[PDB]
Amino acid sequence: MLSRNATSSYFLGWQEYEKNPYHEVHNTNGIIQMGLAENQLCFDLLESWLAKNPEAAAFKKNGESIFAELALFQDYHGLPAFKKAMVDFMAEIRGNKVTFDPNHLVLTAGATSANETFIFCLADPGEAVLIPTPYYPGFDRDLKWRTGVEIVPIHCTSSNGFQITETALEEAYQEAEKRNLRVKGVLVTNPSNPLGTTMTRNELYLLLSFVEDKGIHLISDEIYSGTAFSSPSFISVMEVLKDRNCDENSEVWQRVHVVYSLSKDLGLPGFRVGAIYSNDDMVVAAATKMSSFGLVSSQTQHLLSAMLSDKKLTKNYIAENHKRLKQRQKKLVSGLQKSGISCLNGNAGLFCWVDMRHLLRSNTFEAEMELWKKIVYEVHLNISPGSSCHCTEPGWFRVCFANLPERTLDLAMQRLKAFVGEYY
């Protein structure tokens, strides 16, 4: 009797790309990848740093080999130097408006591991967490698969730019009741995937007030925090906790947590560097013990400790990343406009939330899937349909702009315009 745990367009389109991937030389007619949120815009900056500072990657420290020491380093508290470099980098991303205690930071194998661990720590099987829609498709697996925890949506609509409202929060909490589920917290993504927008101060205060009243937790996945390239300003959930008489007052501050990773800003998803940050000593202790199942390679911790300790590098990287991200997003927005397609006004992330409602046969998700399939097979472009992100409104699509060359992006825009000018 095989177990239970051992026994979706987002993953579908991805596989379709694998079958016939685009190549500017071999398969110039293949499918162009615009459905995965990755950042290939600044590798030259990191490659340059590595060329000038070869010691870290060589298992050398102060001209001394520390291969053996690192090979043996498996402490679940993480490499001291790396934890310090990380909290400093997290502070810098936030304009030094907030500071993080390295003893309250827990390293994990990517945010994928961090989010699951947070759920294991805050909710028991059969309980639930509330999540604003639309949200990252991966959460359906990360937060529920091995945890036995359920997701209850906090529906957001285009009427107000997909922002969280009081009514949406209570409606979600009430649906949790109808489903006989006990709510343990709210998990938000700030900046938002797939919206490409930074959370507003208003939304943050609304969330804090809500979790305070309900006596639950607030987890903020801020993996895109370093990718805010245009106004308005990114506001970490930890900044709102600063001045509000909650530093050492109230008790809600103990229930606010952050998830981070180096996958999206630095473009290092393969290195699996994730992190959990909590003000609650017990959560930190539990998460630390849990990190045993997904520790970060000491080889990687050492390399990045050296990299992130270079203040000239971090400063220039964030600045250039913002510059290149803004330029690329503008190119996508401009390219889509030429096809009469608009986007939700965004300012962060590695993608745009695109409005293709006017291209639907009808206002239904069935019509959305029809359009999606047509874009995949006829236009040969892989983008994500809003339904994969649980958007309540048919017609929205997530289009990633930083995981391919600029020229390939232009090609994608050309092929899309030919498509719209052909049928509509």
Angle CA(13)–CA(11)–CA(182) in degrees, nearest 5?
A: 140
**Contact (CB, 8 A) for 287 and 139:** no
| Residue 120 interacts with, from a copy of itself, ligand PPG, none (CB under 5-8 Å by kind) | a copy of itself
* Least CB distance to ligand PPG at residue 352 (A): 13
- Is 355 a residue of the active site? no
Task: Give the list of residues 6+ apart from residue 71 with CB closer than 8 angstroms, or none.
Answer: 298
- Is 223 a residue of the active site? yes
- Is 219 a residue of the active site? no
Give yes or no for residue 272 binding a copy of itself (CB under 8 A). Answer: yes
Closest among 391, 388, 409, 392 to 400, alpha carbons compared: 409
Q: Which span sits near a copy of itself by CB under 8 A: 69-77, 337-345, 360-368, 389-397? A: 69-77
Residue 75 among known ligand-binding residues: yes
Q: Which span sits near a copy of itself by CB under 8 A: 25-33, 67-75, 83-91, 321-329? A: 67-75
- What is the per-residue DSSP string for 304-357? HHHHHH-HHHHHHHHHHHHHHHHHHHHHHHHHHHTTT-EE----SSSEEEEE-G
List the one residue from 133, 197, 300, 388 that touches a copy of itself (CB under 8 A): 300
* Least CB distance to ligand PPG at residue 131 (A): 11
Choice between 67 and 205, CB closer to a copy of itself: 67
Give yes or no for residue 86 binding a copy of itself (CB under 8 A). Answer: no
| Residue 377 interacts with, from a copy of itself, ligand PPG, none (CB under 5-8 Å by kind) | none
**Contact (CB, 8 A) for 125 and 149:** yes
Which tokens is 337 given?
């406009």
Give yes or no for residue 59 binding a copy of itself (CB under 8 A). Answer: yes
- What is the per-residue DSSP string for 213-279? HHT-EEEEE-TTGGG--SSSPP--HHHHTTTTT-SSSSSGGGGEEEEEESSSSS--GGG-EEEEEES
| Residue 180 interacts with, from a copy of itself, ligand PPG, none (CB under 5-8 Å by kind) | none
Give yes or no for residue 89 binding ligand PPG (CB under 6 A). Answer: no
List the one residue from 61, 73, 200, 360 that touches a copy of itself (CB under 8 A): 73
**Contact (CB, 8 A) for 331 and 401:** yes
Catalytic residue among 223, 235, 276, 383: 223
Task: Give the list of residues 6+ apart from residue 169 with CB closer than 8 angstroms, or none.
Answer: 130, 154, 186, 206, 207, 210
Site size for ligand PPG (CB under 6 A): 16
- Is 221 a residue of the active site? yes
* Least CB distance to a copy of itself at residue 307 (A): 12
Please report how the helices 9-19 and 365-377 are oriented relative to each other, as an axis angle in degrees rounded to 10.
Answer: 10
* Interacting residues with ligand PPG between 129 and 188 (CB under 6 A): 136, 138
Distance between CA atoms of 6 and 140, rounded to whole angstroms?
16
CA 174 centroid distance within chain: 27
Residue 424 among known ligand-binding residues: no
DSSP designation for 31:
B
Closest among 225, 189, 221, 216 to 389, alpha carbons compared: 189
**Contact (CB, 8 A) for 181 and 126:** yes
* Least CB distance to ligand PPG at residue 361 (A): 27
Give yes or no for residue 263 binding ligand PPG (CB under 6 A). Answer: yes
* Least CB distance to a copy of itself at residue 399 (A): 19
Give yes or no for residue 279 binding a copy of itself (CB under 8 A). Answer: no
Closest among 107, 47, 46, 80 to 265, alpha carbons compared: 46
Active site residue ranges: 136, 221, 223, 264
Would you list which residues are annotated within the binding site for substrate?
75-76, 136, 142
List of residues contacting a copy of itself (CB under 8 A): 1-7, 38, 40, 43, 46-47, 50, 54, 57-59, 65, 67-68, 70-74, 109-110, 112-113, 116, 120-125, 141-142, 146, 148, 184, 263, 267-272, 282-283, 286, 289-290, 292-300, 303
List of residues contacting ligand PPG (CB under 6 A): 36-38, 110-112, 136, 138, 189, 193, 221, 223, 261, 263, 269, 274
